[PDB]
């Protein structure tokens, strides 16, 4: 049997020239790679953007291996060809509107999209064929041989692909002309490289209601590899491919990655690690001995990086080594247990059950005993209350937890059931962790690359392996199924299934993936209506009048009533979304005069990552102008210094507003407010 | 034969209690009247608004007279009954979009709505029956007897009227629920009083939205009046008139230089042989031996010009009422003076398509220093808005600057020639009651106007001078309803209800909001607006100095540009020109003389300020028109010594902020000066 790795590939959008790209990271938290003319990885990336300030695509290399785990290439004996067929699609315009956890079958059938009344995107299209044409699907492309290149283009749709679809003609807002979902290549030895979209995002309504008939060039889908041997026999093996938006901080790793997601699903559903979990009973095994370096240390290291992209100082006690994390002894147990007991336990997946650990913000509210519980971040629903969407039992999950496997292992550590030193690897290839370990695992509201369908074991045929629904001959004739939920049918995924739930266009997830102000007093409430009534009596009196003279006072009463229908219920806590993937609080990086003049800031100052992108619509147009957060001291392990690099400072205008301009008091002009923005006009 | 007067009645909208109204002015520039319980006029209006600040409707009294010109009432011997039937309708939503002079057949058949491709309003309705339903038509109502009252309500449509229509249900924006076009009453002796609408303006699209404005309605109307007088012997005679409803007259003592009575009179002279001594119908020329009269013909013009200063800044017109020479001296010695006066008046443009270089495109007497004066009257003409090349046309009709009507100008010319008398002259053969209604409406310019537009200049809608020709009869409309696409000016067979007001803005509050000033180009006769592209190319250079000995750093410089493009703005050089100062004031004097009104208005008395201050958008005018002041003579008891100020403004609606200039400029030294800013909060 052959195997293809990675099992789930990851590419990232880029708007630079089609031929100007980097290759995939080779580890979790790894930089992507420059390459040579043979398309073999060389050194890590020099610049993420080209000279014009356009983002380079990141491509995924896939490799195929024989029965003894030896790599097969066009140079291997007895191999005469290797043909890769990749079928990517974007089903987002054909899917349901995103409503947090509604639609997620892990909470039971009563939380199905139908049971919850979730509406379809582009809801005026109700016939099946009209829904199918909302999908961006240009059919499968194939590549083989030495240094091949084929676009997944609207201009080379195979004649055997009977039902292609895409947004045709000139779009009225955003990107005008859709043309491509990406590019397939082979390297000098026949390996596959998949490159995804270009960052296209356009549509025919004003984003400003608005938002119908919009599209992006995110996609995902199947990978098929046929290796033909000298005698014309062959073997076939498969994988999946996902395209994400750019990784703007690739060295910073999510506390729970999508690799952690796949692993946890694997352990609890596919017997991936029999020693850790008893599939017969549905419980972890309390005699499982964790390993510090493999299981615990990465959590601590991930936590320690968030400071470069967010203000989460309350997490500092978890990477301080204020005591010895490697000491398994009974004398150190109360310390390890205290550390562990500050992590939020997982909520059950029961509808209507609100008083649960992920609705708890703090360890206590007694002064002296107050600490935000860990990890400190939004959960998968801090946005809608129990009573939204005409429901009374909408699922809430306000604050973050680790995944169940991470937390189990952390608890073994706390118990003293762990070792120090090397452990052997789990039975998961490194190539499989290196792709999706660079994608967000939690929270998922919806997420960045993928959302909570990936937590559902029914989409997998085994740990880390996406189950495929049907095959090329089926789709050739029928096209893709717009209304089919792979989580409901359980018989596999189609192209477009892994990304369809995400925002359409993705630049909305990016614009919103910042912070959330999250209520922490009422477990069933995220937002409430708020009425602010201000009643004012103005009284006038006149004086400094002559001794003869008196004038009557005057007074009147005025009131204002401001109603906001859905605001976070106080008291609330400032909570991050995805700092590694959508930075917020970052250090300025220009160390030379020219970059300081154009950015208007000195180096080393913490400022807002998205400053100047003042609207959703501006994010849709100008995403590519943002910085990549990177370690400026990368050559010296252990002494990181992450700053913005490669921001297109020339895009932004700037005004320094004196505080007395706002207040009317000129004494306040000793203080000023920097304001970044994009001049509407503006020309080069 | 009977006659009904006025031939064209005028009522004004009001949102006060249905029972709380004033009666019509009795002369041009006359205040409306309070009335007694018998609905007879008593003395002129005390307050235009009720105690809540709601505007009182103005109703029109109609009287019927016998062959002897004796008034007939229920008290007349031989009169058994007087029965009035009034049919008002609003066809605005069913008519064409207003595009200045497009559609006006006085410019020839090539200027027809169809030749000019003017779109219908609510253009997605194309079937005749669907166009018909856009009309607000509740059928006719009748009234007779002593002190009768009948509403023109959606709840009392006669069963014989088969095709009523109106906007039913709850409107999404503005006024919610349409119910009535007005009220018919009789007085104690059986005279008719017509009261019009309540100021309703609502619709189902967002006015502030792009392309918004479809499916909007107001409660303006107009239509036919029929009077049947039944005598003791049960015989009867019938006679007819017309009725128009306009928006409030916010400065009723201030008269338009050319009123709608002037329009009807001009039409009558030129087309209906109204004054055979003035005009030769056989040759189509005025008679040069006609002797004008100063008091009747000339003086009113001078008096009207002298009032505009209360509502606009038109000081250049001051020489035309200065009596710097004796206007009543008809002698040769004063002729050069008279002629100089006359020669500062614009001659009328011919109405020939494509002929731009004409007198109404000329602003000044010359542009030679010492010889510069704006020609008269100094106001916008009937198209200072759209150029020759708009609306997909190449010869769109332009008329930039105002002229008198042809008859006023002829008479002024006779005065200049010395062909005029001083002293009384006998009236023209037009009833004073017919002048008193429409003499209080705008005659020129019409773009579109206030109460009515340029179809009133078309002789084909009249059956004689001042008399509207009626199309069909009551029975026809009972069965067929109104004809939505029918142009009375095209068919020449008379008017239907709704015809006199349908061309005006829908809602009228758009005409009121726009009826302010125009910045009018005066260099290119074919151009009103142009695109304007402003490109600003800026080199920023930095140098550093005061450095220690031996230290230098390089200069830095870079270049940036902005390109603003405004698509349709006035082409410079342009002139600040008024629209309708008497009917839509712009520069007016504050009027609050006690402390409370000053605190609420935020202004001392006697200061000239903007009339609409605080109504910062079109949508706010639609909602809050009734908050605006009435401009009136505070010194009305003293003939010759006028003092017009605002009165009755609903100051409490508006909020106020004083902005220091250094808030804008960033320079605190500028805070010695401030800018008043009025606005409407809404959360009030």
Swiss-Prot record, chain A:
It is found in: Secreted. InterPro entries: LodA (IPR033797), LodA_C (IPR041173), LodA_N (IPR041168). It comes from the Bacteria. GO terms for biological process: defense response to bacterium; killing of cells of another organism; negative regulation of single-species biofilm formation. The keyword Ribonucleoprotein does not apply. Induction: Forms part of an operon with lodB. Its EC number is 1.4.3.20. One of its GO terms (molecular function) is L-lysine 6-oxidase activity. The modification Tryptophylquinone is found at residue 578. Inhibited by aminoguanidine, amiloride and beta-aminopropionitrile. The cysteine tryptophylquinone (CTQ) is generated by oxidation of the indole ring of a tryptophan residue to form tryptophylquinone, followed by covalent cross-linking with a cysteine residue. Keywords: Antibiotic, Antimicrobial, CTQ, Oxidoreductase, Quinone, Secreted, Thioether bond. The intracellular stability of LodA is dependent on the presence of LodB protein. Homotetramer. Has antibacterial activity against a wide spectrum of Gram-positive and Gram-negative bacteria including nosocomial isolates of S.aureus and Pseudomonas sp. The antimicrobial activity is due to hydrogen peroxide generated by its lysine oxidase activity. Also has autotoxic activity. Involved in biofilm differentiation; responsible for cell death within microcolonies during biofilm development which is linked to the generation of a phenotypically diverse dispersal population and thus may play a role in colonization. This is L-lysine 6-oxidase. It comes from Marinomonas mediterranea (strain ATCC 700492 / JCM 21426 / NBRC 103028 / MMB-1). The lineage of its organism: Bacteria, Pseudomonadati, Pseudomonadota, Gammaproteobacteria, Oceanospirillales.
């Amino acid at each position: 049997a052959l195997s293809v790795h990675p099992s789930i590939g990851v590419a990232r959008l880029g708007n630079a020239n089609t031929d100007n790209f980097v290759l995939n990271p080779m580890e979790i938290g790894g930089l992507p790679y420059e390459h040579d003319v043979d398309l073999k990885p060389t050194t890590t990336v020099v610049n993420f953007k080209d000279e014009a300030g356009c983002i380079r695509r990141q491509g995924q290399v896939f490799k195929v291996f024989g029965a003894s785990n030896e790599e097969l290439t066009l140079d291997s004996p007895n191999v005469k060809n290797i043909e890769w067929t990749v079928h990517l699609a974007n089903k987002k315009a054909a899917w349901y509107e995103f409503r947090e956890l509604n639609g997620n079958l892990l909470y039971g059938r009563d939380n199905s999209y139908s049971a919850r009344g979730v509406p379809w995107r582009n809801a005026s299209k109700t016939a099946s064929s009209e829904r199918q044409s909302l999908i961006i699907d240009l059919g499968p492309r194939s590549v083989s041989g030495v240094m091949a290149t084929v676009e997944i283009s609207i201009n080379n749709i195979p004649e055997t692909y009977l039902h292609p679809s895409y947004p045709s003609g000139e779009l009225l807002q955003g990107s005008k002309h859709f043309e491509s979902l990406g590019t397939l290549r082979t390297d000098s030895q026949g390996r596959l490289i998949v490159l995804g979209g270009y960052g296209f995002a356009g549509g025919n309504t004003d984003l400003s209601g608005g938002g119908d008939d919009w599209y992006d060039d995110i996609s995902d889908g199947s990978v098929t590899c046929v290796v033909t041997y000298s005698d014309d026999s062959s073997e076939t093996s498969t994988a999946w491919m996902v395209v994400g938006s750019p990784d703007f901080a690739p060295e910073i790793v999510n506390i729970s990655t999508l690799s952690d997601t796949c692993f946890d699903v694997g352990v609890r559903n596919f017997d991936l690690v029999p020693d850790m979990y008893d599939s017969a009973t549905g419980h972890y095994k309390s005699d499982y001995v964790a390993n510090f370096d493999r299981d615990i240390l990465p959590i601590i290291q991930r936590i320690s990086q968030y400071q470069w992209v967010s203000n989460v100082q309350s997490m500092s006690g978890f990477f301080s080594f204020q005591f010895d994390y490697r000491d398994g002894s009974a004398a150190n147990k109360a310390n390890r247990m205290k550390y562990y007991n500050y992590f939020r336990q997982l909520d059950n997946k029961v509808i209507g059950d609100y008083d649960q650990p992920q609705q708890v913000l703090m360890s206590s509210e007694v002064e002296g005993d107050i600490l935000p519980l860990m990890p400190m971040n939004s959960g998968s629903n801090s946005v809608s209350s129990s009573n939204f969407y005409d429901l009374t039992d909408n699922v809430v999950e306000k604050f973050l937890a680790l995944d169940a496997t991470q937390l189990f292992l952390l608890g073994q550590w706390a118990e003293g059931e762990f070792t120090a030193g090397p452990a052997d690897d789990y039975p998961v290839s490194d190539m499989d962790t290196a792709s999706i370990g660079n994608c967000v695992g939690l929270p998922m509201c919806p997420g960045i690359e993928m959302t909570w369908s990936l937590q559902n074991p029914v989409i997998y045929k085994d740990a880390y392996q996406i189950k495929h629904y049907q095959d090329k001959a089926y789709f050739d004739v029928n096209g893709l199924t717009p209304e089919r939920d792979e989580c409901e049918e359980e018989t596999g995924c189609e192209p477009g299934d892994l990304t369809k739930r995400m925002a359409c266009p993705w630049q909305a997830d990016f614009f919103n993936c910042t912070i959330q102000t999250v209520n922490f007093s009422e477990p069933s409430v995220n937002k409430a209506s708020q009425t602010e009534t201000v009643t004012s009596r103005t009284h006038y009196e006149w004086g400094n009048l002559p001794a003869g003279v008196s004038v009557p006072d005057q007074s009147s009463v005025s009131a204002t009533k401001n109603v906001d229908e859905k605001v976070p219920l106080p008291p609330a806590y400032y909570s991050y979304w995805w700092p590694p993937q959508s930075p917020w609080d970052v250090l300025t990086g220009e160390l030379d005069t020219e970059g300081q003049l154009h950015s208007h800031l000195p180096a080393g100052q913490q400022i807002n990552y998205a400053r100047g992108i003042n609207s959703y619509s501006q994010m849709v147009e100008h995403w590519s102008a943002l910085a990549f957060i990177r370690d400026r001291n990368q050559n010296n392990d252990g002494f990181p210094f992450f700053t913005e690099t490669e921001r297109n400072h020339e895009l932004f205008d700037f005004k320094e507003v004196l505080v007395g301009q706002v207040t009317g008091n000129s004494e306040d002009n000793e203080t000023s407010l920097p304001v970044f923005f994009i001049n509407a006009n503006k020309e080069s």
